[PDB]
Structure formats: structure tokens, C-alpha cells
Paper text:
Arabidopsis MORPHEUS' MOLECULE1 (MOM1) is an exceptional TGS regulator that acts largely independently of changes in the levels of DNA methylation and H3K9me2. Surprisingly, only the predicted nuclear localization signal (NLS) and a short fragment of MOM1 of less than 200 amino acids (1663 to 1859) containing a conserved plant-specific motif of 82 amino acids (1734 to 1815), named Conserved MOM1 Motif 2 (CMM2), is required for TGS activity. We solved the structure of this domain and found that it forms a dimer with each monomer consisting of unusual consecutive 11 amino-acid hendecad repeats folding into an antiparallel coiled-coil.
The best diffracting crystals were obtained with a MOM1 fragment corresponding to amino acid positions 1700 to 1814 (for experimental details, see and Materials and methods) and a complete dataset was collected to a maximal resolution of 3.2 Å. A poor electron density map, most likely the result of the absence of stable secondary structure, prevented us from building the first 28 as well as the last 3 amino acids of the CMM2-containing fragment. The structure reveals that the CMM2 motif folds as a long α-helix. Two such helices form an antiparallel coiled-coil structure. The asymmetric unit contains two identical coiled-coils that further interact via their N- and C-termini to form the crystal lattice. The mutual association of two CMM2 monomers occurs mainly through a large interface formed by hydrophobic residues. In contrast to the classical coiled-coil structure, CMM2 monomers are not wound around each other and, therefore, do not generate a left-handed super-coil. The CMM2 fragment forms dimeric coiled-coils with extensive hydrogen bonds or salt bridges mediating inter-chain contacts via residues at positions g and k.
Residue numbers in the entry:
A (entry chain A), B (entry chain B): 1732 to 1813
The structure:
């Protein structure tokens, strides 16, 4: 640059494009970290939850086998009479 | 319960009622801590964000005041006639 004024002015217009830039990018990084932490906190939830739900379905098919062993040994030892 | 068959049956209604109880309550807890983890991941993203936004607005007024300071200086050294 010839004019040390037009110079300083560009040195600063440039200086504020770096500003606008590193800001725009940080802004993106965070947005993209939050996105990932949230998808991973919700996949940790979905995990434990499908285990809790499994534990129960097995809990109740047990309770289930048995309820029907009762109803059978009853119905059986009772047609032994009629 | 006089009837022993009726007894086995009640013993089971009672067991299935705790299957449901502890399941629904396990469920209720996992959901409670999802709320809590997500709430705080996202309320510390904002804490981190506003700190870049802040950091930028200060950078930018810094520049703005270098600019202004350099323009007026030109304007003054150049404050005459003919």
C-alpha cells in the first residue's frame, strides 16, 4: 500500500475479518459439541432403558410360567376327581 | 386365604404388582436423570457460548476504536485551508 492511512485502514479491515471469522467458527464448534454430547447422553439413556425393560419382561414371563403351573396342577389334580 | 389355590394366585397377583411397581419406578428415575444431564449439558453450552460472544464484542469495539482513532487523526493533520 502507498498511503499509510489507506494502509492502517486495511490492516484493520483485515483484523476484523479474522475476528468475525474465529468467532463464526467457535460458534460452530460449540454448536457441534453440544450436538454430540446430547446425542451421547441420550444413547446412554436408551441403553440402560432397554436393559430395565428387558429385566422386567423376563421378570414377568417367569411370574407367567408359574401362574399357569398353578392353574394346571390345580385343574389336573381336580379332574382326577371329576 | 383359606383356599390354598386362591392363595398361590394372590401371592402372584402380589408379585406381578411389584414387577410393575419397581419397573415403573426404575423407568421414572432414568428419565429423571436424563432431564438432569441434558439440562446441564445445554446450560453450560450457553455459558460457554455467551463467553465467545462476549469475547468477540470486546474485540470488535477494540478495532472500531482503533479505526475511529486513526480516521480522526488523519482528519486533524489535514485541518486547514488553501
Amino acid at each position: 500500500f502507498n498511503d499509510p492511512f489507506l494502509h492502517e485502514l486495511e490492516k484493520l479491515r483485515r483484523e476484523s475479518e479474522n475476528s468475525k471469522k474465529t468467532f463464526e467458527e467457535k460458534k460452530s464448534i460449540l454448536k457441534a459439541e453440544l450436538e454430540r454430547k446430547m446425542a451421547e447422553v441420550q444413547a446412554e439413556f436408551r441403553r440402560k432403558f432397554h436393559e430395565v425393560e428387558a429385566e422386567h419382561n423376563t421378570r414377568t414371563t417367569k411370574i407367567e410360567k408359574d401362574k399357569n403351573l398353578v392353574i394346571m396342577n390345580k385343574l389336573l389334580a381336580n379332574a382326577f376327581l371329576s
